[PDB]
Amino acid sequence: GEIVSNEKSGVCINAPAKTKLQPSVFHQVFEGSKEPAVLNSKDPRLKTDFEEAIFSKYTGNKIMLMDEYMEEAVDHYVGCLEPLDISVDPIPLESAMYGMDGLEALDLTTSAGFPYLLQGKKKRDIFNRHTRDTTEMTKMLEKYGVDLPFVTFVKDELRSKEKVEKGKSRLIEASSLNDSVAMRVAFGNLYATFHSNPGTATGSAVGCDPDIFWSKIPILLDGEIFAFDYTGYDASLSPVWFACLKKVLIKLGYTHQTSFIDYLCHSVHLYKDRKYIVNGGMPSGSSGTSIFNTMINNIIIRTLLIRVYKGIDLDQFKMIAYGDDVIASYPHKIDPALLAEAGKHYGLVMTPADKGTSFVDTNWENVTFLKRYFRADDQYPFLIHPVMPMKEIHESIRWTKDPRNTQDHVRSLCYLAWHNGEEAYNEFCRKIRSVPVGRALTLPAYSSLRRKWLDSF
Ligand SMILES: Nc1nc2c(ncn2[C@@H]2O[C@H](COP(=O)(O)OP(=O)(O)OP(=O)(O)O)[C@@H](O)[C@H]2O)c(=O)[nH]1
């Protein structure tokens, strides 16, 4: 990803200077070091230029036409997807807006994007989940069209003290409501297929249920495990990776809808009173960002494997990925340090899994996926617990954007926490009930959460 242009947009995007994250009632109870991310360049916590930091993710492009490894990697991934029988047909407008089998309704809580945010117009002024009306969206598609700019927001989230000082805040590139809906029309059936088929054919975990799907993961990835980290994955994508993705879509039957992939690769963005064009890089908050980044990751690993290892047999290779996060398997040991050496040739920055200093071996006890660990059950060791560290749950419970939502928040964290055991769950359930706001909530018991968990298999 490279910013090839920066011009005067003609409009102004005014984002708020103050974060919505306020310390919660549990700010003192539990310990934590994360603070709200830097949103403006005048934040006293800064220790370097804000706009230099947030845009430095664009490290440049490796301009190249698809090499032979990419072509073979593309074919193999197409071969894995062939039995899924993906329909390139478009889904009706009502389903793209309000949902169908395997596709949740479009999220109404986020920005409608350009130009609606400049008109005091929100998604609920066009969308109406109760009536499921489409006439307003049809008129809006007719009036403002497609291939509209993205709106760059600083992501208002918790970050480490280190990333607060270095200004490493993340960005949301919010698609126009027109382009999200139109893209969901073009690729909706593919989204549904992926969401309903997490595994090693899709190589995807998007739309999965960790409670259910964690047990299938070690069965699918039944060989020598390896994993690694990406630094700035989305923005590091060169256009050639978008070309591979296009060739995958073409082999599945897509024709005119590959234009949406061009729309993500060569993208227009609005930030403040600026209008900048990025050559390459995946936008953060486009519809289908997760899946297309997941499909591109399938192409990347395969490409690197063929390039590094001489007589690799991709039909013995298996992987599951969610955006940049990937867990992979091969019968013989694969060293990610050698793969990273090849990924730098393509502009990819691959580093040891989970911020480690060294490249050490990956096993079913240290490996994580979607921040969660793998721990088998004691009574049913064939059932694998997805274990979110209590650390992440403490960092999260300590802040809130809406103290009215404390109940939903805490119980959401209870669905994640009880996988750490009876000891951790009740310690965390006891510390919550240690303040007046706590015991007023409804906290499920360890035995009850377990009851529904095992009833699902
Ligand atoms: N910018 C952005 N990235 C997102 C978002 N959601 C998921 N991501 C992914 O998360 C990655 C950003 O992770 P960071 O917190 O910046 O960490 P990092 O890029 O791996 O950098 P290091 O942690 O130092 O290695 C991006 O590469 C995206 O692929 C989002 O809303 N905005």
Short mmCIF file of C-alpha atoms and ligand atoms in Angstrom, two decimals:
data_model
loop_
_atom_site.label_atom_id
_atom_site.label_comp_id
_atom_site.label_asym_id
_atom_site.label_seq_id
_atom_site.Cartn_x
_atom_site.Cartn_y
_atom_site.Cartn_z
CA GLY A 1 0.00 0.00 0.00
CA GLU A 2 1.26 3.42 -1.07
CA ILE A 3 -0.32 6.87 -0.92
CA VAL A 4 0.11 8.02 -4.53
CA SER A 5 -1.92 11.23 -4.20
CA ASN A 6 -3.07 13.73 -1.58
CA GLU A 7 -5.39 16.54 -2.67
CA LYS A 8 -7.89 19.06 -1.34
CA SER A 9 -11.14 17.09 -1.13
CA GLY A 10 -13.55 20.03 -1.16
CA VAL A 11 -15.30 18.78 1.99
CA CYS A 12 -14.41 18.49 5.67
CA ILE A 13 -14.55 15.36 7.83
CA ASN A 14 -14.80 16.44 11.48
CA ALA A 15 -14.11 13.54 13.84
CA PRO A 16 -14.35 14.02 17.61
CA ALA A 17 -11.25 14.99 19.57
CA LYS A 18 -12.24 13.11 22.74
CA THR A 19 -12.61 9.35 23.12
CA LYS A 20 -15.85 7.74 24.25
CA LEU A 21 -13.94 5.27 26.46
CA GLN A 22 -14.46 6.33 30.07
CA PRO A 23 -13.14 4.31 33.03
CA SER A 24 -15.77 1.87 34.24
CA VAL A 25 -16.78 0.95 37.78
CA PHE A 26 -14.29 -1.93 37.50
CA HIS A 27 -11.37 0.39 36.65
CA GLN A 28 -9.90 0.03 40.15
CA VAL A 29 -11.07 -3.55 40.83
CA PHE A 30 -9.01 -5.19 38.08
CA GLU A 31 -5.54 -4.20 36.90
CA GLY A 32 -4.74 -2.99 33.41
CA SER A 33 -2.34 -0.85 31.42
CA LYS A 34 -4.23 -0.03 28.22
CA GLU A 35 -5.60 3.47 27.61
CA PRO A 36 -7.82 4.95 24.88
CA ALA A 37 -6.03 5.38 21.57
CA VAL A 38 -4.78 8.78 20.45
CA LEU A 39 -7.45 10.42 18.28
CA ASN A 40 -6.00 13.88 17.63
CA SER A 41 -2.51 15.25 17.02
CA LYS A 42 -2.66 17.56 20.09
CA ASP A 43 -3.00 14.76 22.67
CA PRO A 44 -0.47 15.35 25.50
CA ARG A 45 0.24 11.63 25.71
CA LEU A 46 1.92 11.79 22.28
CA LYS A 47 5.69 11.40 21.89
CA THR A 48 5.94 11.62 18.06
CA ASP A 49 3.97 13.01 15.13
CA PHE A 50 0.46 11.56 15.05
CA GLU A 51 -0.26 11.78 11.32
CA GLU A 52 3.20 10.41 10.49
CA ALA A 53 2.53 7.39 12.70
CA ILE A 54 -1.01 6.48 11.65
CA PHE A 55 -0.18 6.66 7.93
CA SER A 56 3.26 5.00 8.07
CA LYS A 57 1.43 1.67 7.75
CA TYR A 58 1.67 2.28 3.98
CA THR A 59 5.16 0.86 3.50
CA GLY A 60 5.04 0.88 -0.31
CA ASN A 61 4.28 -1.64 -3.04
CA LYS A 62 6.24 -4.38 -4.79
CA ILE A 63 5.15 -3.64 -8.36
CA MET A 64 5.12 -6.97 -10.19
CA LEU A 65 2.96 -9.18 -12.36
CA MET A 66 1.86 -12.52 -10.89
CA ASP A 67 4.78 -14.93 -10.76
CA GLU A 68 4.51 -18.69 -11.23
CA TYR A 69 4.13 -19.49 -7.52
CA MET A 70 1.09 -17.22 -7.36
CA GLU A 71 -0.48 -18.91 -10.40
CA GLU A 72 -0.13 -22.37 -8.84
CA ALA A 73 -1.25 -21.10 -5.43
CA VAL A 74 -4.29 -19.53 -7.09
CA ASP A 75 -5.20 -22.79 -8.82
CA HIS A 76 -4.87 -24.87 -5.65
CA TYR A 77 -7.08 -22.53 -3.61
CA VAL A 78 -9.63 -22.58 -6.43
CA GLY A 79 -9.46 -26.37 -6.23
CA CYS A 80 -10.20 -26.33 -2.50
CA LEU A 81 -13.13 -23.95 -3.09
CA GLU A 82 -14.56 -25.89 -6.05
CA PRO A 83 -16.52 -28.45 -3.94
CA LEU A 84 -18.22 -25.65 -1.98
CA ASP A 85 -20.23 -24.79 -5.13
CA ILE A 86 -20.14 -21.02 -4.69
CA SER A 87 -22.89 -19.28 -6.66
CA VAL A 88 -21.74 -16.11 -8.44
CA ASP A 89 -25.38 -15.06 -8.76
CA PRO A 90 -26.40 -11.83 -7.00
CA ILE A 91 -28.57 -11.95 -3.90
CA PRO A 92 -31.70 -9.76 -3.73
CA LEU A 93 -31.33 -6.24 -2.37
CA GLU A 94 -33.41 -7.11 0.71
CA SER A 95 -31.00 -9.90 1.69
CA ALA A 96 -27.89 -7.76 1.21
CA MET A 97 -29.47 -5.11 3.43
CA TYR A 98 -31.33 -7.15 6.05
CA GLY A 99 -29.77 -10.60 5.94
CA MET A 100 -30.30 -14.16 4.73
CA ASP A 101 -29.08 -17.66 5.55
CA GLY A 102 -25.41 -17.31 6.40
CA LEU A 103 -25.38 -13.50 6.22
CA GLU A 104 -26.17 -11.23 9.16
CA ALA A 105 -28.08 -8.01 8.60
CA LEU A 106 -25.88 -5.05 7.72
CA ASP A 107 -24.69 -3.40 10.93
CA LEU A 108 -26.81 -0.29 11.52
CA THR A 109 -24.58 1.15 14.26
CA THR A 110 -21.68 2.30 12.05
CA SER A 111 -21.28 5.22 9.68
CA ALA A 112 -23.25 5.35 6.43
CA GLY A 113 -20.12 6.86 4.89
CA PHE A 114 -19.89 9.36 2.06
CA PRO A 115 -21.84 11.46 1.32
CA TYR A 116 -24.41 10.72 4.01
CA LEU A 117 -22.26 11.70 6.99
CA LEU A 118 -22.02 15.20 5.47
CA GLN A 119 -25.84 15.36 5.29
CA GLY A 120 -26.77 14.41 8.86
CA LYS A 121 -27.98 11.14 7.35
CA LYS A 122 -27.52 7.80 9.12
CA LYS A 123 -28.08 4.16 8.20
CA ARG A 124 -31.40 4.05 10.05
CA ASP A 125 -32.74 6.86 7.85
CA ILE A 126 -32.31 4.52 4.86
CA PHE A 127 -32.52 1.12 6.58
CA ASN A 128 -35.56 -0.13 8.52
CA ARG A 129 -35.13 -3.66 9.87
CA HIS A 130 -38.79 -3.74 10.93
CA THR A 131 -40.32 -3.05 7.51
CA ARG A 132 -37.29 -4.45 5.62
CA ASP A 133 -37.95 -1.71 3.06
CA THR A 134 -35.66 -1.39 0.04
CA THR A 135 -37.15 1.57 -1.87
CA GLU A 136 -35.06 4.20 -0.06
CA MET A 137 -31.82 2.30 -0.67
CA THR A 138 -32.72 1.90 -4.35
CA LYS A 139 -33.17 5.66 -4.71
CA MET A 140 -29.92 6.30 -2.83
CA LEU A 141 -28.04 3.90 -5.11
CA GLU A 142 -29.54 5.66 -8.13
CA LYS A 143 -28.69 9.14 -6.83
CA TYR A 144 -25.12 8.76 -5.53
CA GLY A 145 -24.02 5.63 -7.40
CA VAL A 146 -21.07 3.39 -6.56
CA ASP A 147 -17.27 3.63 -6.49
CA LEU A 148 -17.55 6.33 -3.77
CA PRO A 149 -14.70 7.40 -1.46
CA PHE A 150 -13.94 5.82 1.88
CA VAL A 151 -14.13 7.90 5.07
CA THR A 152 -11.08 7.53 7.31
CA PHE A 153 -11.81 7.43 11.04
CA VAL A 154 -9.30 6.98 13.83
CA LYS A 155 -10.42 3.81 15.59
CA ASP A 156 -11.55 4.73 19.12
CA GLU A 157 -10.27 1.70 21.03
CA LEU A 158 -7.93 0.68 23.83
CA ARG A 159 -4.24 0.46 22.98
CA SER A 160 -1.04 -0.29 24.84
CA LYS A 161 0.84 2.47 26.61
CA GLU A 162 3.61 1.94 24.05
CA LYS A 163 1.28 2.40 21.07
CA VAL A 164 -0.30 5.45 22.72
CA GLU A 165 3.07 7.22 22.91
CA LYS A 166 4.15 6.16 19.40
CA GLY A 167 0.80 7.28 17.99
CA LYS A 168 0.12 3.82 16.52
CA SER A 169 -3.63 4.29 16.41
CA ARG A 170 -5.56 2.19 13.93
CA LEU A 171 -7.78 3.57 11.17
CA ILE A 172 -11.28 2.66 10.01
CA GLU A 173 -11.79 3.15 6.27
CA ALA A 174 -15.59 3.16 6.24
CA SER A 175 -17.17 2.30 2.89
CA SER A 176 -20.10 4.27 1.55
CA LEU A 177 -23.41 2.60 2.36
CA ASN A 178 -23.87 2.28 -1.41
CA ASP A 179 -20.66 0.29 -1.89
CA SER A 180 -21.24 -1.97 1.13
CA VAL A 181 -24.73 -2.93 -0.06
CA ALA A 182 -23.76 -3.24 -3.74
CA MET A 183 -20.78 -5.42 -2.81
CA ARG A 184 -22.94 -7.61 -0.57
CA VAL A 185 -25.27 -8.01 -3.56
CA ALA A 186 -22.40 -9.15 -5.78
CA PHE A 187 -20.66 -11.47 -3.28
CA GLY A 188 -23.40 -12.32 -0.77
CA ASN A 189 -23.65 -15.99 -1.70
CA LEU A 190 -19.87 -16.33 -1.38
CA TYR A 191 -20.00 -14.69 2.06
CA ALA A 192 -22.72 -17.11 3.17
CA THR A 193 -20.81 -20.14 1.88
CA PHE A 194 -17.67 -19.07 3.74
CA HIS A 195 -19.56 -18.29 6.96
CA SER A 196 -21.35 -21.65 6.88
CA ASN A 197 -18.17 -23.60 5.98
CA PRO A 198 -15.36 -22.63 8.38
CA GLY A 199 -12.49 -25.04 7.88
CA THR A 200 -9.62 -26.00 5.61
CA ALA A 201 -11.48 -25.83 2.29
CA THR A 202 -12.32 -22.14 2.67
CA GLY A 203 -9.22 -21.81 4.82
CA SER A 204 -11.44 -19.45 6.80
CA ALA A 205 -12.75 -19.00 10.33
CA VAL A 206 -14.87 -15.93 9.55
CA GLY A 207 -18.35 -16.20 11.02
CA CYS A 208 -17.44 -19.17 13.21
CA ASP A 209 -18.45 -19.99 16.79
CA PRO A 210 -15.28 -20.56 18.87
CA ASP A 211 -17.28 -22.65 21.36
CA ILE A 212 -18.23 -25.06 18.57
CA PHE A 213 -15.48 -24.63 15.99
CA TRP A 214 -12.47 -24.88 18.33
CA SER A 215 -13.01 -28.64 18.64
CA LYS A 216 -12.81 -29.16 14.86
CA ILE A 217 -9.61 -27.11 14.47
CA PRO A 218 -7.06 -29.71 15.71
CA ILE A 219 -8.85 -32.43 13.71
CA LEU A 220 -8.52 -30.44 10.48
CA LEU A 221 -5.01 -29.19 11.29
CA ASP A 222 -3.77 -32.64 12.26
CA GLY A 223 -0.07 -32.23 11.36
CA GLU A 224 2.99 -30.16 12.26
CA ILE A 225 1.60 -26.77 13.31
CA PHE A 226 3.11 -23.38 12.51
CA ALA A 227 1.90 -19.81 12.91
CA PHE A 228 3.29 -16.28 12.80
CA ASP A 229 2.44 -12.59 13.03
CA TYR A 230 1.92 -9.90 10.43
CA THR A 231 2.91 -6.27 10.89
CA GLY A 232 0.41 -4.01 9.14
CA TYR A 233 -1.04 -6.81 7.01
CA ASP A 234 -3.92 -4.93 5.34
CA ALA A 235 -1.88 -1.87 4.36
CA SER A 236 1.13 -3.98 3.31
CA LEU A 237 -0.85 -5.70 0.54
CA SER A 238 0.59 -4.87 -2.87
CA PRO A 239 -1.74 -4.69 -5.89
CA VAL A 240 -0.37 -8.03 -7.14
CA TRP A 241 -2.14 -9.75 -4.23
CA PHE A 242 -5.40 -8.15 -5.34
CA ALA A 243 -4.66 -9.49 -8.83
CA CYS A 244 -4.35 -13.03 -7.44
CA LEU A 245 -7.69 -12.57 -5.66
CA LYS A 246 -9.26 -11.41 -8.93
CA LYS A 247 -7.96 -14.52 -10.72
CA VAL A 248 -9.50 -16.68 -7.98
CA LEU A 249 -12.87 -14.97 -8.40
CA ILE A 250 -12.69 -15.29 -12.19
CA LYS A 251 -12.06 -19.03 -11.96
CA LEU A 252 -15.16 -19.36 -9.74
CA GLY A 253 -17.30 -17.67 -12.42
CA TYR A 254 -17.17 -13.96 -11.49
CA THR A 255 -16.96 -11.48 -14.36
CA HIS A 256 -18.01 -7.85 -13.85
CA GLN A 257 -17.89 -8.08 -10.04
CA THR A 258 -14.09 -8.20 -9.94
CA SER A 259 -14.49 -4.41 -10.26
CA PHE A 260 -15.18 -4.35 -6.51
CA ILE A 261 -11.67 -5.73 -5.97
CA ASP A 262 -10.21 -2.85 -7.97
CA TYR A 263 -12.34 -0.60 -5.75
CA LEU A 264 -10.51 -1.92 -2.67
CA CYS A 265 -7.02 -2.02 -4.19
CA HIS A 266 -7.02 1.46 -5.79
CA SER A 267 -9.11 3.25 -3.17
CA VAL A 268 -10.14 6.87 -2.57
CA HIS A 269 -10.22 8.09 1.03
CA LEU A 270 -11.55 11.18 2.80
CA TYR A 271 -9.81 12.36 5.97
CA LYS A 272 -10.27 15.86 7.41
CA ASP A 273 -10.34 18.21 4.36
CA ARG A 274 -8.07 15.83 2.42
CA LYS A 275 -8.60 13.33 -0.39
CA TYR A 276 -5.84 10.74 -0.83
CA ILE A 277 -5.57 7.75 -3.15
CA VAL A 278 -3.90 4.51 -2.04
CA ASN A 279 -2.42 2.08 -4.57
CA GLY A 280 -2.93 -1.28 -2.89
CA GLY A 281 -3.74 -2.04 0.72
CA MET A 282 -7.02 -3.39 2.06
CA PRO A 283 -9.45 -0.88 3.65
CA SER A 284 -10.40 -1.72 7.20
CA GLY A 285 -14.14 -1.22 7.30
CA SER A 286 -15.21 -2.21 3.81
CA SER A 287 -17.83 -4.90 3.51
CA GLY A 288 -16.10 -8.19 2.87
CA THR A 289 -12.75 -6.94 4.19
CA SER A 290 -12.46 -9.95 6.51
CA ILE A 291 -13.25 -12.51 3.81
CA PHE A 292 -11.14 -10.99 1.04
CA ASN A 293 -8.21 -10.59 3.43
CA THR A 294 -8.83 -14.22 4.39
CA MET A 295 -8.87 -15.36 0.76
CA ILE A 296 -5.71 -13.35 0.05
CA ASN A 297 -4.02 -14.98 3.06
CA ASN A 298 -4.84 -18.38 1.54
CA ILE A 299 -3.02 -17.27 -1.62
CA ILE A 300 -0.07 -15.81 0.30
CA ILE A 301 0.90 -18.84 2.40
CA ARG A 302 0.55 -21.19 -0.57
CA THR A 303 2.70 -18.85 -2.67
CA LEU A 304 5.41 -18.67 0.00
CA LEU A 305 5.36 -22.43 0.61
CA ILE A 306 5.92 -23.29 -3.06
CA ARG A 307 8.69 -20.69 -3.23
CA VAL A 308 10.57 -21.71 -0.07
CA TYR A 309 10.10 -25.50 0.03
CA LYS A 310 11.15 -27.52 -3.00
CA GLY A 311 8.70 -30.42 -3.38
CA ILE A 312 5.90 -29.18 -1.18
CA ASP A 313 2.58 -30.93 -1.80
CA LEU A 314 -0.18 -28.39 -1.19
CA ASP A 315 -2.70 -31.24 -1.09
CA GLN A 316 -1.03 -32.15 2.22
CA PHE A 317 -1.15 -28.51 3.37
CA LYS A 318 -4.03 -27.14 5.43
CA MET A 319 -4.69 -23.74 6.97
CA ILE A 320 -7.41 -21.74 8.69
CA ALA A 321 -7.27 -17.95 8.71
CA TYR A 322 -9.26 -14.89 9.80
CA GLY A 323 -7.89 -11.83 8.05
CA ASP A 324 -4.18 -11.79 8.83
CA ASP A 325 -4.51 -14.27 11.70
CA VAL A 326 -3.63 -17.77 10.47
CA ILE A 327 -3.15 -21.25 11.93
CA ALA A 328 -1.56 -23.71 9.52
CA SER A 329 -0.48 -27.34 9.29
CA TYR A 330 1.78 -29.58 7.20
CA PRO A 331 2.92 -33.18 7.79
CA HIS A 332 6.57 -32.09 7.99
CA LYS A 333 7.78 -29.18 10.10
CA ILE A 334 7.53 -25.79 8.37
CA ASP A 335 9.68 -22.92 9.62
CA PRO A 336 7.91 -19.53 9.44
CA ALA A 337 11.25 -17.67 9.55
CA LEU A 338 12.06 -19.08 6.11
CA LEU A 339 8.57 -18.17 4.90
CA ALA A 340 8.98 -14.64 6.26
CA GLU A 341 12.24 -14.31 4.32
CA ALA A 342 10.16 -14.93 1.19
CA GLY A 343 7.27 -12.71 2.29
CA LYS A 344 9.58 -9.70 2.44
CA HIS A 345 10.30 -10.25 -1.26
CA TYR A 346 6.56 -9.58 -1.72
CA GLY A 347 6.42 -6.68 0.74
CA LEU A 348 4.97 -8.73 3.61
CA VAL A 349 6.34 -8.30 7.14
CA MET A 350 6.00 -11.63 8.96
CA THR A 351 7.33 -11.96 12.52
CA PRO A 352 7.22 -14.59 15.30
CA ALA A 353 3.77 -15.52 16.55
CA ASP A 354 2.31 -13.30 19.29
CA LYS A 355 5.02 -10.63 19.43
CA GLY A 356 7.77 -13.04 20.49
CA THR A 357 11.45 -12.16 20.26
CA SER A 358 12.56 -15.43 18.65
CA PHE A 359 11.08 -17.88 16.18
CA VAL A 360 10.27 -20.82 18.43
CA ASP A 361 8.19 -23.90 17.63
CA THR A 362 4.40 -23.78 17.57
CA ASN A 363 2.39 -26.41 19.46
CA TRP A 364 -1.21 -26.84 20.63
CA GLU A 365 -0.28 -25.34 24.02
CA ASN A 366 1.34 -22.02 23.05
CA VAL A 367 -0.56 -21.33 19.83
CA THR A 368 -3.38 -18.79 19.71
CA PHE A 369 -6.05 -17.99 17.14
CA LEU A 370 -8.33 -14.95 17.41
CA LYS A 371 -6.52 -14.19 20.72
CA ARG A 372 -7.78 -17.53 22.13
CA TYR A 373 -5.81 -20.53 23.37
CA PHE A 374 -6.57 -24.22 22.86
CA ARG A 375 -7.14 -26.33 25.98
CA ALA A 376 -8.90 -29.68 25.94
CA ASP A 377 -11.64 -30.45 28.43
CA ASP A 378 -10.98 -32.75 31.37
CA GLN A 379 -14.13 -34.87 31.10
CA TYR A 380 -14.25 -34.72 27.27
CA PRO A 381 -10.67 -34.15 26.03
CA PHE A 382 -11.99 -34.32 22.46
CA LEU A 383 -13.72 -31.00 23.23
CA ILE A 384 -11.26 -28.10 23.05
CA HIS A 385 -11.91 -25.00 25.15
CA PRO A 386 -11.25 -21.66 23.42
CA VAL A 387 -9.40 -19.81 26.17
CA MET A 388 -9.29 -16.02 26.01
CA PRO A 389 -6.67 -14.92 28.59
CA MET A 390 -8.20 -13.29 31.65
CA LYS A 391 -5.76 -10.43 30.97
CA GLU A 392 -7.68 -9.33 27.87
CA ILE A 393 -10.93 -9.64 29.84
CA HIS A 394 -9.55 -7.40 32.60
CA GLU A 395 -8.29 -4.79 30.13
CA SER A 396 -11.77 -4.72 28.58
CA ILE A 397 -13.95 -4.64 31.71
CA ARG A 398 -12.03 -1.61 33.05
CA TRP A 399 -13.37 0.79 30.38
CA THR A 400 -16.74 1.57 28.82
CA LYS A 401 -18.24 3.83 26.17
CA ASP A 402 -21.79 3.56 27.55
CA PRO A 403 -22.29 2.66 31.24
CA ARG A 404 -25.86 1.70 30.31
CA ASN A 405 -24.47 -1.33 28.44
CA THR A 406 -22.50 -2.64 31.43
CA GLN A 407 -24.77 -5.69 31.69
CA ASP A 408 -24.40 -6.85 28.07
CA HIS A 409 -20.67 -6.11 28.31
CA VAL A 410 -20.06 -8.16 31.46
CA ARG A 411 -22.11 -11.18 30.37
CA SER A 412 -20.34 -11.10 27.00
CA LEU A 413 -17.10 -11.35 28.98
CA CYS A 414 -18.58 -14.19 31.03
CA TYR A 415 -19.10 -16.30 27.90
CA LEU A 416 -15.36 -15.93 27.28
CA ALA A 417 -14.00 -16.15 30.83
CA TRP A 418 -15.50 -19.42 32.10
CA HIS A 419 -13.18 -21.31 29.72
CA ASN A 420 -10.22 -20.51 31.99
CA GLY A 421 -11.60 -22.89 34.64
CA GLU A 422 -13.74 -22.81 37.75
CA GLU A 423 -11.06 -21.00 39.76
CA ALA A 424 -10.54 -18.08 37.38
CA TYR A 425 -14.24 -17.72 36.54
CA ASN A 426 -15.44 -17.39 40.15
CA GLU A 427 -12.55 -15.15 41.14
CA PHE A 428 -13.58 -12.93 38.23
CA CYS A 429 -17.26 -13.43 39.10
CA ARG A 430 -16.53 -12.55 42.73
CA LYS A 431 -14.54 -9.38 42.03
CA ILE A 432 -17.41 -8.09 39.87
CA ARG A 433 -19.96 -8.65 42.64
CA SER A 434 -17.58 -6.82 45.01
CA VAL A 435 -19.03 -3.41 44.03
CA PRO A 436 -22.71 -2.28 44.08
CA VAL A 437 -22.88 -2.15 40.27
CA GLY A 438 -21.74 -5.78 40.05
CA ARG A 439 -24.27 -7.82 42.02
CA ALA A 440 -27.13 -5.91 40.36
CA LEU A 441 -26.14 -7.79 37.18
CA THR A 442 -27.07 -11.37 36.25
CA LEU A 443 -23.95 -13.54 36.16
CA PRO A 444 -24.32 -17.11 34.85
CA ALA A 445 -22.79 -19.82 36.98
CA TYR A 446 -19.88 -21.96 35.84
CA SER A 447 -22.01 -25.12 35.92
CA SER A 448 -24.82 -23.58 33.85
CA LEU A 449 -22.56 -22.24 31.10
CA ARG A 450 -20.97 -25.70 30.91
CA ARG A 451 -24.41 -27.30 30.63
CA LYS A 452 -25.28 -25.43 27.43
CA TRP A 453 -21.73 -25.79 26.09
CA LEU A 454 -21.80 -29.60 26.12
CA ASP A 455 -25.44 -29.71 25.00
CA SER A 456 -24.32 -28.15 21.70
CA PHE A 457 -22.25 -31.15 20.57
N1 LIG B 1 -6.47 -0.39 10.66
C1 LIG B 1 -7.26 -1.36 11.11
N2 LIG B 1 -6.81 -2.66 11.14
C2 LIG B 1 -7.60 -3.67 11.59
C3 LIG B 1 -8.89 -3.38 12.03
N3 LIG B 1 -9.47 -4.53 12.42
C4 LIG B 1 -8.59 -5.54 12.24
N4 LIG B 1 -7.43 -5.03 11.72
C5 LIG B 1 -6.22 -5.83 11.40
O1 LIG B 1 -5.33 -5.70 12.49
C6 LIG B 1 -4.06 -5.26 12.06
C7 LIG B 1 -3.59 -4.11 12.94
O2 LIG B 1 -2.97 -4.62 14.09
P1 LIG B 1 -2.07 -3.64 15.00
O3 LIG B 1 -2.75 -3.39 16.32
O4 LIG B 1 -1.78 -2.35 14.26
O5 LIG B 1 -0.75 -4.52 15.21
P2 LIG B 1 0.22 -4.83 13.96
O6 LIG B 1 -0.26 -4.15 12.70
O7 LIG B 1 0.33 -6.32 13.77
O8 LIG B 1 1.64 -4.23 14.42
P3 LIG B 1 2.46 -4.98 15.58
O9 LIG B 1 1.47 -5.45 16.62
O10 LIG B 1 3.46 -4.03 16.20
O11 LIG B 1 3.19 -6.17 14.99
C8 LIG B 1 -4.19 -4.80 10.62
O12 LIG B 1 -3.14 -5.31 9.83
C9 LIG B 1 -5.52 -5.35 10.14
O13 LIG B 1 -5.30 -6.43 9.26
C10 LIG B 1 -9.36 -2.06 12.00
O14 LIG B 1 -10.49 -1.79 12.38
N5 LIG B 1 -8.53 -1.06 11.54
#
